[PDB]
């Protein structure tokens, strides 16, 4: 059987990650080691040199020295290697985006042993990036060439976007209205294991996590905002702007930063089709195909550090995170500090914000019941290892399932 390695990097607003996969004739995956995926990261992310383009392709070279010592020297000028920026490169503006993408391009052709393809490096649509992760969590799951009804939804939560993508019927698929503004179409339609699929699948720019925090900042400017802590005072620097921000001498506020959440979302937007989420965004139907939802990235990274979300992933309810607000809005800086310990120093000031505007997303945002049941996850258990829940498996099955011989497990 003829074998292929995939080297897939994501470059995220906040962070680099390298992926490497290998795989046999039919699309199942190979072990590297006794593991199915080596990984590897690097902060801050390319967006963050958008003024030094040169040297964003240079923070890449650590990850892309690790990736080509785990795949076979022998294996390297016919093993793919891509590149996908998403959100952070999506919100700068423009030239800045290309220029960074192409120093990488020149450095992955100058200094990559591997193959380079004219498409390797680029900044992928929303609409893709939901998909590949919908790709990505459904062939983990083996939900993959089953009717529509019985495959998995996903909502991706990274820094600067999200993206819900769902499985949907001919039917809602052939009376899709016409995308508003300035955005993209609701679908997509791709072929996965000789089925044919119609996802729908929609990216919210600036509805990130931490573009959501910033969001939520602007509204109180001048002022103390209700959503941090008591004790708390800093300069908080994101997508090339300063912010002054602070928590309220009298503390944080549940309500108050509720209010907020749902404030920045634009619920009461006018929506050209119904139903809608919020913007005036239409919601896709959220039939059968997304009963079931893997919910990922950072109602991931936090849950789980304050321990009510457990690795690799675990059951929960979206009312996990109202009362994980709850609490983190109910306590000082200070005490933060010491009931939280496992959270990440310069991601502790933002625990009342983070999971509040999470649980507003969620239900307020897509309409989930609070009571039902999700999935929060940073990997699937596949076979005897952990394999990530992200979007690059989705872009490493595109990319393989083309080479020549080999089975065609998805495309389009
Ligand atoms: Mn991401």
């Given at each position: 059987?003829?074998?292929?390695?995939?080297?897939?990097?994501?470059?995220?607003?906040?962070?680099?990650?390298?992926?490497?996969?290998?795989?046999?004739?039919?699309?199942?995956?190979?072990?590297?080691?006794?593991?199915?995926?080596?990984?590897?990261?690097?902060?801050?992310?390319?967006?963050?040199?958008?003024?030094?383009?040169?040297?964003?392709?240079?923070?890449?070279?650590?990850?892309?020295?690790?990736?080509?010592?785990?795949?076979?020297?022998?294996?390297?000028?016919?093993?793919?290697?891509?590149?996908?920026?998403?959100?952070?490169?999506?919100?700068?503006?423009?030239?800045?985006?290309?220029?960074?993408?192409?120093?990488?391009?020149?450095?992955?052709?100058?200094?990559?042993?591997?193959?380079?393809?004219?498409?390797?490096?680029?900044?992928?649509?929303?609409?893709?990036?939901?998909?590949?992760?919908?790709?990505?969590?459904?062939?983990?799951?083996?939900?993959?060439?089953?009717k529509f009804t019985k495959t998995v939804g996903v909502i991706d939560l990274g820094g600067a976007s999200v993206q819900?993508?769902?499985?949907?019927?001919?039917?809602?698929?052939?009376?899709?209205?016409?995308?508003?503004?300035?955005?993209?179409?609701?679908?997509?339609?791709?072929?996965?294991?000789?089925?044919?699929?119609?996802?729908?699948?929609?990216?919210?720019?600036?509805?990130?996590?931490?573009?959501?925090?910033?969001?939520?900042?602007?509204?109180?400017?001048?002022?103390?905002?209700?959503?941090?802590?008591?004790?708390?005072?800093?300069?908080?620097?994101?997508?090339?702007?300063?912010?002054?921000?602070?928590?309220?001498?009298?503390?944080?506020?549940?309500?108050?930063?509720?209010?907020?959440?749902?404030?920045?979302?634009?619920?009461?937007?006018?929506?050209?089709?119904?139903?809608?989420?919020?913007?005036?965004?239409?919601?896709?139907?959220?039939?059968?195909?997304?009963?079931?939802?893997?919910?990922?990235?950072?109602?991931?990274?936090?849950?789980?550090?304050?321990?009510?979300?457990?690795?690799?992933?675990?059951?929960?309810?979206?009312?996990?995170?109202?009362?994980?607000?709850?609490?983190?809005?109910?306590?000082?800086?200070?005490?933060?500090?010491?009931?939280?310990?496992?959270?990440?120093?310069?991601?502790?000031?933002?625990?009342?914000?983070?999971?509040?505007?999470?649980?507003?997303?969620?239900?307020?945002?897509?309409?989930?019941?609070?009571?039902?049941?999700?999935?929060?996850?940073?990997?699937?258990?596949?076979?005897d290892a952990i394999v990530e829940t992200a979007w690059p498996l989705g872009t490493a099955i595109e990319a393989i399932?083309?080479?020549?011989?080999?089975?065609?497990?998805?495309?389009?």
């Open positions: 059987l003829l074998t292929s390695y995939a080297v897939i990097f994501d470059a995220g607003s906040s962070g680099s990650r390298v992926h490497v996969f290998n795989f046999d004739q039919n699309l199942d995956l190979l072990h590297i080691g006794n593991d199915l995926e080596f990984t590897k990261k690097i902060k801050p992310g390319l967006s963050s040199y958008a003024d030094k383009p040169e040297k964003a392709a240079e923070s890449l070279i650590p990850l892309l020295e690790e990736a080509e010592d785990v795949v076979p020297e022998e294996l390297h000028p016919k093993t793919p290697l891509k590149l996908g920026a998403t959100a952070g490169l999506r919100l700068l503006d423009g030239d800045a985006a290309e220029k960074i993408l192409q120093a990488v391009r020149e450095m992955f052709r100058n200094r990559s042993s591997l193959s380079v393809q004219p498409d390797a490096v680029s900044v992928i649509d929303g609409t893709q990036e939901g998909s590949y992760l919908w790709v990505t969590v459904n062939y983990l799951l083996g939900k993959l060439g089953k819900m993508a769902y499985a949907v019927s001919r039917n809602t698929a052939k009376n899709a209205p016409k995308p508003p503004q300035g955005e993209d179409p609701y679908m997509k339609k791709l072929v996965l294991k000789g089925k044919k699929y119609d996802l729908y699948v929609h990216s919210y720019l600036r509805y990130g996590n931490d573009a959501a925090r910033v969001k939520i900042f602007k509204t109180t400017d001048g002022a103390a905002s209700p959503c941090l802590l008591a004790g708390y005072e800093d300069i908080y620097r994101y997508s090339g702007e300063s912010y002054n921000i602070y928590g309220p001498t009298s503390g944080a506020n549940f309500n108050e930063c509720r209010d907020l959440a749902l404030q920045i979302l634009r619920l009461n937007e006018p929506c050209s089709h119904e139903n809608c989420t919020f913007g005036g965004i239409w919601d896709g139907g959220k039939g059968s195909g997304q009963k079931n939802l893997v919910v990922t990235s950072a109602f991931y990274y936090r849950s789980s550090e304050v321990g009510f979300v457990t690795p690799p992933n675990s059951k929960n309810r979206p009312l996990d995170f109202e009362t994980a607000a709850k609490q983190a809005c109910s306590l000082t800086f200070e005490e933060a500090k010491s009931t939280f310990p496992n959270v990440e120093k310069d991601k502790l000031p933002f625990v009342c914000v983070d999971f509040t505007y999470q649980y507003t997303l969620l239900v307020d945002g897509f309409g989930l019941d609070p009571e039902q049941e999700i999935t929060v996850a940073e990997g699937i258990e596949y076979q399932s083309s080479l020549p011989k080999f089975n065609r497990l998805m495309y389009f």
